Symmetry: D2
């Protein structure tokens, strides 16, 4: 049974970049719905797996990918943010960033473009290619999780579903993108990156 | 050259069901963007076609369907609503509903279900299957237009992208679908239906 | 644990319509590969389901849908054929066919078109819409099974993957389609149809 | 207006790796069909564009990508093979391979894997990522062209549609991939690579 992870900060901890009403709705309603529905889908899949019912297994895949991805993506998103966040990463991460994208600034333009490039619902991701030994930017639709669908390890995710910025930025997604760089918890992204080495 | 069609009513004509802030943004911002992006992409397609650049034609397909479909979908959506609508449709349309979905209420549930069932951005539609000569409900992702990607003729469309309801209903998409039944322009839906019989 | 179902007839039982080399390869190699790989995927999913690993669950969905669909689709396909097959169905099925598509002949053109319309790998299907109480034709890509992905109940399936006709018909898929109507086991399709009533 | 390009060799020039019957059918039937369907669809798109019919433009997109991509993909495929190829590439290309994939053998495994991994119809590609300035392997479904749908520049493409090998290797797709390494036209692949450095 999955559960809703608490927010490492208060709903208002990210103001003014991301107002309090968003954080509250996003975490308590949207994220909670994924967990609730994820646990239900898993129970039904467990049942179908025992009865050897492949047709039921398959029919349940959309619900599983959507709610599971939703749970995975958001669990990561909350940690990718911090009221103390902002600025540039330090050490190996910054070095890797320079090594793969050129400069921290070009990295930003690339991740911002990948995030702005999403038509419909989705996420923009900075990941790690274990196979290639280097960073990599990618975009996923709806709630498709990065690792489950691309093999890449998630380091930083930017939610560009409309519920993530509309109440404050309306249709101007570029402003939300310009604003979130101020709350990026590079401390956590560095953690995940370092984890990719071991 | 495509143009933004004026609404058949004022931004506040659908209160309290769909507020004026949503209507103004939806039309003047979202839809207007589709129009311009549609025109630009079309012109870009004209240059690629003339130069026989198939790679460019193909790279342009996502924008064409997204902005083209966006223009098609919302143009229909505005006509599907009315400050003097709601209730049950009159004439043959209602009989088709009774015949193809059992009853008006059962019809509302199915379209509401098809609408609530969109994971991510999309539209729920009541269309006409010319081949079978009867009504048929379907859901389309993002801005994919009903007829261009399915052949069914659009009769009634329900925009379930988060920008269609978030400012008013937040995450409660079912509250938005419940309210919209009050402003359905049955007259226009009947017109479209009869057209599939011209 | 799934197993490879025996063929209701010998590999040459469908000549000349579908030669023996196809039937043998199709059943013993292609179909057998699905079963082998399906059982493996299910074991891995069972493991991931216990560890609460959603990322692994999701990553395994493509393998599960492809091999499970492959196992479901082909198990049905073998029964949809018969050396004694051919002709038109009788009783309720024929009646339903006339009622939903007009005539047996128009039904054929529709199923043939849906089958010819498949770009890439896939199947053409005649199914039953439990909700609507009537027949319905649809097409599925690759090994996506009918019921698991559309809710429709499979009655007759026509495999249009290239391995199903290339050795004999090469690129002329229309000849394979024209030929298979001679081996359609209407007795089995009638069975599945009647099952949809109960 | 598009035309079927002549092969740089005779239908039997690739024996025993890819037999003459496959080469003749692949080129004279499959590819030729893409060309004509591409030209017809393009002309149909011209009429829809002129009449500003967005629904028609969109309904035509599947044929355009399928026949357009089919023409793009096979035109490249013919140039990727040679009766005087095989072995290891010479010059910078090989060094890039060593650098991006570890070694030539490791490169073959990854592309062979990406190729065997296509479920249904598709292509396995070795492309160049201009943004990152390095090699990158990717797989594309059906006839979706590499550059038009991913931005990567095609260097080497391996057709894994069943018509590319069935008449000779039957279901044993791995035997076909193993054999094709003997006719890779490294000279052409190097040319394409250097072009991403012009
Ligand atoms: Mn979100
Ligand atoms: Mn909208
Ligand atoms: Mn098959
Ligand atoms: Mn081919």
């Amino acid at each position: 049974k999955h559960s809703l992870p608490d927010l490492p900060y208060d709903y208002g901890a990210l103001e003014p970049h991301i107002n309090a009403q968003i954080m509250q709705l996003h975490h308590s309603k949207h994220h909670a719905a994924f967990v609730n529905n994820l646990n239900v889908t898993e129970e039904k899949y467990q049942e179908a797996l025992a009865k050897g019912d492949v047709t039921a297994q398959i029919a349940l895949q959309p619900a599983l990918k959507f709610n599971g991805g939703g749970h995975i993506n958001h669990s990561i998103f909350w940690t990718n943010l911090s009221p103390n966040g902002g600025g540039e990463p330090k050490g190996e991460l910054l070095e890797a960033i320079k090594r793969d994208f050129g400069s921290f600034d070009k990295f930003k333009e690339k991740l911002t473009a990948a995030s702005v490039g999403v038509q419909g619902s989705g996420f923009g991701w900075l990941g790690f290619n274990k196979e290639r030994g280097h960073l990599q930017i990618a975009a996923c639709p709806n709630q498709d999780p990065l690792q489950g669908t691309t093999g890449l390890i998630p380091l930083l995710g930017i939610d560009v579903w409309e519920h993530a910025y509309y109440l404050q930025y309306k249709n101007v997604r570029p402003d939300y993108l310009k604003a979130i760089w101020n709350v990026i918890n590079w401390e956590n992204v560095t953690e995940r990156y370092m984890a990719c080495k071991k």
